[PDB]
Design a protein around this ligand. Structure first.
Ligand SMILES: Nc1ncnc2c1ncn2[C@@H]1O[C@H](COP(=O)(O)OP(=O)(O)O)[C@@H](O)[C@H]1O
Ligand SMILES: Nc1ncnc2c1ncn2[C@@H]1O[C@H](COP(=O)(O)OP(=O)(O)O)[C@@H](O)[C@H]1O
Ligand SMILES: Nc1ncnc2c1ncn2[C@@H]1O[C@H](COP(=O)(O)OP(=O)(O)O)[C@@H](O)[C@H]1O
Ligand SMILES: Nc1ncnc2c1ncn2[C@@H]1O[C@H](COP(=O)(O)OP(=O)(O)O)[C@@H](O)[C@H]1O
Ligand SMILES: Nc1ncnc2c1ncn2[C@@H]1O[C@H](COP(=O)(O)OP(=O)(O)O)[C@@H](O)[C@H]1O
Ligand SMILES: [Zn+2]
Ligand SMILES: [Zn+2]
Ligand SMILES: [Zn+2]
Ligand SMILES: [Zn+2]
Lengths: 368, 374, 366, 368, 367
């Protein structure tokens, strides 16, 4: 297919071009004697259409496309590895070709040698493209030079990308000018490419039986501000804290050698949503969980592992006395309670600046 | 068979029509260029006759029916997957056809099942092609199912089948009665209420048991006992009355869609905990004693409570700390704050129900009457 | 075999007849359009001759008998193949009876699909099954059609025991000097096979040269019958006096309110009490009685929120202080329920001591 | 072989006769219409020559003998089961025959053995099978059911008399001068095995290759006082059975639904040898371990499971509070410390009666 | 090969002769009707050349030698057992033959090995089998039963004398100038293995081909630490004479029990811990196992054997923390009581202990 079939990929699109450009005219890269990346990995949540982009890459390159899922290869004994080799053998025949390995996470057991085979053909010296919803599950070997050395991240669509996406699948149906897609775009924040595509279908199906009715088959404009505050509080602290680095971007679209002074500023920024959550709404949400968990981990690490604890001391505690335990839990509480204060205070001063970002976020959903 | 062979499904019936309507005239849906759902999942307890409805769908659509159980495919090596493909290959041959996958949980999540299910995925993912084959599935335990199964196209539609009410029960007894000799002496309305929250098959088996008791020589009473009060219906009515009544009075709750006898703010979390304790209260407010039926109600309350303290940092004393081994002192803090948060939420609940007790006691009898209401 | 080969089961016998009657004349049941049970499960201890009855059913019905053990049903699918194979040949000899001894064995591994096959085939001939341990069985086994019928086989009483001895006696040369009624009571709660083996052991002891006494000892008290009589007397007597209990269907020497839960705990403490009230000492036979009481107690406190001190909290992990609360409330609830029990039995002690001796005599009553 | 080749078996010999008598004249047993035991199990330590007796049974009966070890059948998949049937098929051909299954423990407890045993069980249910197990409690209860290994015969380590007798048999197989006295070695080797003794001869005969040599061999296998030490442990145990009301006197004393009152007397007996050791030697041995362990178990059961604890109460404890724990540990200590006293006291009075058994045991080694 | 190819085996050599003598003239043993041992096990650390001696046994007996490793037989299913049978079948063909089973631990520990072992046992029950294990306690009891590996011979790391002797043998295989003294290297390498020494030569011979070179090889791996070790072992051994319920050690090298017996052991376990302080004033880490064993016995006295005053006649091996504190303290009592009797004994006879030390630094072993 075309890159015109994909919307709001712009940066990702240009990132994938260097691959497209390779497959077309490898000679320009062969000219200076420059080895081409064999592997490119697409990381993203389900419905981000990681598959769609892979096809489009081949499309824009007019190159052969061989879709293979990790579920397929992952077979009695060596059958999978045979399928791996087999695929690559036929794939080499249609060179320049693209192989897509959906759920690379899928490929212990026969997978081990299947993976080994996957790694084998790759280093053999055709560009392999892979898609993982859960990338931290991946063996480090997969990311080494040559093999999936390139990595491109696909984000849930923003309001602009959402409306744009609705327009593409809309053409596949007869949509009266009465329905506004910008209205639904915002109505569905952090929805997936496929989620939206299915909404249209659901409506189109509802019509023939006889898009708002379809929204309801998903089984608040205020909660968008609530989220706006969690993210506002997080991001705002990066400028004011010395040992932080300003956020590359601030979004309300789900993203589904360090000094004590550096460690602590992080903990403060983790509390920047527990903060603005009261500063603004006076109540805390459950969305702090991971924010609290990360803070607490760093805190525990300071005390137990890094010996940055005043009371507990320069000891590695990672089975000890209950007395020793109470010491840790207490120093952890302090470090955290301090960092929350410094955070609550900073945001209270610049509250006007924070409340600015909130609505701006409820508007643009994303900014830098 | 017919939708006329099924009782107490009217809403479910209308829900299944959109499938029936597809199989008949796919062109109407192909007109605007609208992709048809490939998969439709029926969720319900055993005996709810999830199978019955699936047949009737094909019946009303005059379509081919291929029953396959998850237990079948779930086989040496790839044999199951072969059976999956095999079924779909022959199923494509009788298009428009319906495939029924009873106990989808059996193949729904690794092992042979993994590729067997990976297979179901590929088979049903058919392609842009119409195919005109719709997969129907029935699961007693749906939370066991792999997320992949519920993705767009594949079992994207989900229809929930409820244990029959008093009306559906009597209606059901009448259908299987015709299959036997029913003396005008047996009243089915009497048995209908006598058997609240019984299953379509449970009732159907009662008839059989009677029919069997006959051949050994009213008699349907002796059969009731071979399954081995009207007061307990009020007891249940109180648990559910207490639960539901609180939804109106609590700001951060949403009124219950129905009441039957068959990113969240602290303020939202707490109201839930109160509602959980609801029936625990009405149980004393009305009967002065508590039942064991609170277990899950208590468990869920306590979970939310623990989450507030430990994970969400919504605890006053414990603080904004993530506690998921720590000091016993730290433990006592959690157990104590959890106890408070719960004891509070129970009070707010017990108090509310005490005032509107007359309104709650209204629902009780009304529940013993309608068994279900909005 | 015949139902005449089985003794002291009239009730079980008459329960199995409805199956026998089906196999003979299915048409009468087909007339009114009544589906016949495909599965019937026999639950009982080892030696209760669950197998014997299954044969006899076919016997009295003159029907084909296919014995298959759960232990039999294997590499991969082989067991399932054997399942299918059996049912295929079994369908050929219809009306036939299939007996699945140790259904527990097939009721994870190949068993799963073997079971699935068992279920599969049944859904498609009456299958009979025997389990010593029925709680191990998947609920699926008991669904309508498939083992929907369940019949419980009890260890033989004094009458059934004597009757049983007489049947295997005919298989040997036992002088009229040996009285089987004497041995019947001498062996309370012995199994059909246990008794049958005693005869054999004697018959064997004879050939080496009344002798049946020497055989009793090669198993390598009339007072202990009263001890048991007290445990069961105490248990049963409380059912009448306690409001929220239901009287016991039988007494042998073989959606719940707080108020209902507590009465049970009291009943559990029945035999514990009576042992002291009568013998002044407690036996070890209280274990399960204590365990069940304690479970209910714990459940009241931890899960059901029926604890005064502990509160409406789900504790099923927590501070030691929170633990001590549970252990203490549990102890109270139990110690209370024992008292209410000990007290009741003390008053009606004369009524309890009545049942005791009567039990040493009738062994079972209602 | 003959029963005359086995020594100190007399009781075991008479026990095995009923089997011998069957194999000879099965008609006598067929006369009264008596089904014959298909299985007979021999239980004993290694070297008790469980195998020897099995052969001799066939010998005295002039019957065919088929030795098969559990280790053999225990065989890829079904191979062993086929071997089971194969043996039984050929065994039925030589009927009346005896099959000996050494290390029945090997086939008697996951897969092959499950079917293997099923097969063993299957074939038996269908020739008398004889089996030998050093560890019988490892065996599945199914093995002991009526017909299948329903008979059980226990073989004891040879006493002083059996020892001397045994030495004499293997002596004939060598050139042992009448100067060496076997009664001297018999007592010198208490609780030695039939094979242990037989090996001593061999080792001596091997030493004779250099050309009171049997003494040098005793040492190459790498106390008259310790015999009294043991005599005291066993004296203390046995003596208590007469004096305690709720006990039953020991069937034998060698140096090779229960009431609280019954439970407690046991605990006292368990403490018997622990006491006598102090009363006589003033010191305790380590040989109390199992004696202590069993006492403590009964004690724990009284408190935790049977509700026979005064302080702890009628509660089933088998996770609880530390306070609840301390209660159990303390009640257990009392119950034991009491039962030890009652024991220590009893033995102190009848010390002269206990000291009597001591030497009598160091003499007769066994008594009733 | 020859027994002359092996050095410092003297006692082991004479121990192996009875095997050699059998294989040569079996009739002498068959004369009186005496069954011959089928199995003989060699127990020793790696490099003790357990293999070397096995060959030499056959050599001095002019008998066939069939080397088979446990790693070999240890195969799909029954494959190894077939290899076992095959070996013994062909081995029977070259009778009188010797079979050597290196790493018997590999087949001696169910799995394929179980039936492979069973086959090993089976075949032996039916040629003398010789086996070598570095870890003998891993071995199934069945292996040691009468006939099957009923004989056991222990092979020791070479002493200073055996070391020098060993160096001389592999020296002949190379061009070693009379300038290098092997007695110098012998002591320089205490508790080194037959192969370790042999490899030193090689390493030197390799260093030569690039061209007192044997010294550079030493480094491609302290005379004071010999005294440190001498003290740990001096303290251990010296206590055996003075303690009533002990038995003196057969030798001292630098390479149903009464309470009274148990306790003396604990004191002995503390010997080296003491002597290190009495002499060097500091304790080493080499006490670990010495402490561990002491503590185990201590714990056993209290918990299992009911030899504890405070804890009582109770079997404790899940209990209250209060009950725990009682145990941990009875132990520190017994343990410190023991270390004391010991520390004192060694303080008095310190002059006797300091003697054994130097004698040890010299003799490396003594009786
Ligand atoms: N640019 C896009 N706009 C809209 N929908 C898209 C886009 N890209 C992909 N999709 C949708 O995503 C779904 C497929 O996602 P896929 O490519 O398989 O990624 P994933 O690996 O996350 O499932 C399809 O339903 C497709 O319509
Ligand atoms: N509408 C109905 N009324 C009465 N009984 C019904 C109805 N639908 C199904 N049943 C009964 O349900 C049983 C089968 O349930 P099934 O369709 O298999 O659902 P499940 O998957 O829960 O077992 C049969 O005994 C049938 O008689
Ligand atoms: N009615 C009976 N009277 C006496 N013995 C009986 C009777 N029924 C069965 N038995 C005995 O029970 C044994 C078989 O029990 P079985 O039928 O296999 O049941 P289980 O499954 O409990 O083993 C045989 O020894 C047989 O003699
Ligand atoms: N009566 C006996 N007297 C002496 N030795 C005996 C006797 N019976 C057997 N043995 C010895 O026992 C050993 C074999 O024991 P075995 O019969 O296999 O029993 P186990 O199963 O305990 O090993 C042989 O060495 C044999 O000499
Ligand atoms: N007497 C000896 N003197 C010196 N080296 C020896 C001697 N015996 C064996 N070795 C050495 O031991 C090594 C082999 O040890 P080996 O016989 O396999 O015993 P292990 O089983 O401990 O490895 C060889 O390098 C050999 O040179
Ligand atoms: Zn509820
Ligand atoms: Zn009871
Ligand atoms: Zn003992
Ligand atoms: Zn040491």
């Amino acid at each position: 297919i075309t890159f015109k079939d994909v919307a709001g990929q712009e940066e990702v699109k240009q990132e994938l071009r260097e691959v497209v450009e390779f497959l077309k005219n490898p000679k320009k890269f062969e000219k200076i004697g420059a080895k081409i990346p064999k592997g490119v990995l697409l990381v993203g949540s389900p419905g981000t259409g990681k598959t769609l982009l892979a096809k489009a890459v081949a499309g824009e390159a007019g190159v052969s496309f061989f879709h293979m899922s990790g579920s397929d290869f992952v077979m009695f004994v060596g059958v999978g590895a045979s399928r791996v080799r087999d695929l690559f053998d036929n794939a080499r025949k249609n060179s320049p070709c693209i192989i897509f390995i959906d759920e690379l996470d899928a490929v212990h057991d026969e997978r081990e040698q299947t993976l080994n085979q996957l790694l084998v053909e790759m280093d053999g010296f055709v560009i392999v493209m892979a898609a993982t919803n859960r990338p931290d599950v991946l063996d480090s070997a997969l990311l080494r030079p040559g093999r999936f050395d390139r990595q491109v991240t696909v984000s849930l669509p923003d309001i602009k990308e959402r409306e744009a996406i609705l327009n593409i699948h809309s053409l596949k149906t007869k949509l009266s000018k009465d329905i506004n897609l910008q209205v639904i775009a915002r109505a569905t924040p952090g929805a997936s490419g496929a989620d939206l595509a299915n909404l249209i279908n659901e409506g189109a199906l509802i019509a023939a039986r006889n898009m708002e009715e379809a929204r309801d088959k998903i089984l608040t404009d205020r909660q968008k501000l609530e989220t706006a505050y969690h993210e506002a509080g997080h991001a705002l602290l990066h400028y004011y804290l010395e040992h932080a680095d300003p956020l590359h971007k601030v979004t309300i679209i789900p993203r589904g050698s360090i000094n004590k002074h550096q460690i602590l500023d992080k903990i403060k920024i983790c509390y920047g949503g527990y903060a603005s959550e009261q500063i603004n709404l006076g109540v805390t949400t459950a969305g702090v969980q991971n924010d609290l968990m990360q803070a607490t981990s760093l805190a525990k690490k300071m005390v137990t592992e890094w010996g940055m604890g005043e009371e507990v001391g320069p000891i590695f505690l990672v089975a000890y006395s209950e007395n020793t335990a109470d010491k840790v839990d207490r120093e952890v509480k302090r470090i955290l309670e301090e960092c929350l204060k410094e955070a609550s205070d900073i945001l209270l001063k610049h509250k006007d600046q924070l409340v600015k970002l909130a609505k701006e976020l409820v508007l643009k959903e994303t900014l830098t």
